Design a protein around this nucleic acid. Sequence first.
RNA 1: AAAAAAA
Length: 508
Amino acid sequence: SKLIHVPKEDNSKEVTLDSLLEEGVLDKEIHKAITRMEFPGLTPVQQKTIKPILSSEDHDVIARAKTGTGKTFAFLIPIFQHLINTKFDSQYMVKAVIVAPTRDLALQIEAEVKKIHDMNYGLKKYACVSLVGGTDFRAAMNKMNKLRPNIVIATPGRLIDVLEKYSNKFFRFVDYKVLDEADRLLEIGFRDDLETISGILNEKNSKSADNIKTLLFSATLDDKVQKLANNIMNKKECLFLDTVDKNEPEAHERIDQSVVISEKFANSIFAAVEHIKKQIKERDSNYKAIIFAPTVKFTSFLCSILKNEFKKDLPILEFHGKITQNKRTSLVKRFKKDESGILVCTDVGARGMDFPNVHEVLQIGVPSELANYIHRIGRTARSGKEGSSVLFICKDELPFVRELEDAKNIVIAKQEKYEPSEEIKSEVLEAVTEEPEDISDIVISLISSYRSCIKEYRFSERRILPEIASTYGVLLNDPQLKIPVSRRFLDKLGLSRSPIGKAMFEIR
RNA sequence: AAAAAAA
Ligand SMILES: Nc1nc2c(ncn2[C@@H]2O[C@H](COP(=O)(O)OP(=O)(O)O)[C@@H](O)[C@H]2O)c(=O)[nH]1
Ligand code: BEF
Ligand SMILES: [Mg+2]
């Protein structure tokens, strides 16, 4: 497979819905649906991609647009059009398969399809079904039989389950497959799954094993994705669409980024509380923000702190992989609607999730992966609206910020140091209603988390892991105290041979 | 222990 590049262009010709109703690209049924939405016009990415996504194969696509540019519709418009173009063939078969890295994002994409339906009841005939984990498998199949969807949105796990069972029944006539947040879906832990999905869909296609057309979408990707997606793309040639300069930062321009650096990792906690407290007062509780954290246990803990002194002011929402899928969905629908509130989450909500009018994005610690910094702050400043972001870290996480300049050319201007007063520390710590053995588990999680991204972020192992583990002493208000561990555990950790192990743990 | 992702 060979790639071709069509970069950004400022003095490009304007494309519009009326212009696509002319030229015979889009049917009138779709033209209505999007016009009803009262958008001033198609976003840059949407204008550039609706064709040649519809154009004749062979021609796989790869789009590159910043966060909040409406990439969803940018591949949802052509799919509906193709479904209209092929109305009288395989009308009871899946023709488009969309894959997303998280359940909530897959459900979001489904909702966006269902919005298009709401804007034009004539499009409802092209049914849609979400195939996701944490939902009733049987009920999903019953819905699969009842509606006979032309569009399937799914997450890799559940999708392989149904394909191994019912690929002959629904998926023998797929023409399009979409990888939303493509780069993540092509990373280790997802790549094998998507190769299994692609292989099954290609193997069972009625016409040709190279029939399916693959679309890759994300706000962060390079030329290395074509190399990494060579096994899932059938067409002889693939054209790369791009609405951001190669040198320009992948992050969104309208985001006012800032860094709050501290001595200790635990210091970032107090800094975040004070920053929120200022914001609530300064905005008169008219504050909608998302706070990211490294681990599930630390999110739950951070959520407990925020509830203890902001629940009076704002709603505090806990969102992570260990939340039941019913609560996750119910939580997502609320925060989408609410004008205010604090969403405390892991990287489940780093990518794709569209929460209207988020004022700020806060971060305690580093993200799961380098690229996810761009996606994290991308939760705000969406669809024209403005926004800012704050990154809370200690003086041992600067290599992450420097790596941000080396790799993704993400330079950040506003930076300031922070030191916690004795007053704020007493307030927070006195409000913690958690046993030392619970504090233990939380701190170990962070050690495990930061141990996992040492190489990627160019950290100094001998410095960070002690500092991370040291938070256990801070929370119990006894700095020199070390977290008690078993000889079998410390050995099981592998740090038994390291001098760093003694600097982190006390074998009790 | 460790972010997602089928029971
Ligand atoms: N103003 C405007 N907003 C749009 C347009 N297309 C989509 N949106 C909005 O942009 C928001 C987020 O878009 P999204 O699909 O998440 O963009 P993505 O992050 O690149 O995938 C949605 O809530 C849409 O309502 C458009 O053409 N104009
Ligand atoms: F780029 Be993501 F879909 F906001
Ligand atoms: Mg998106």
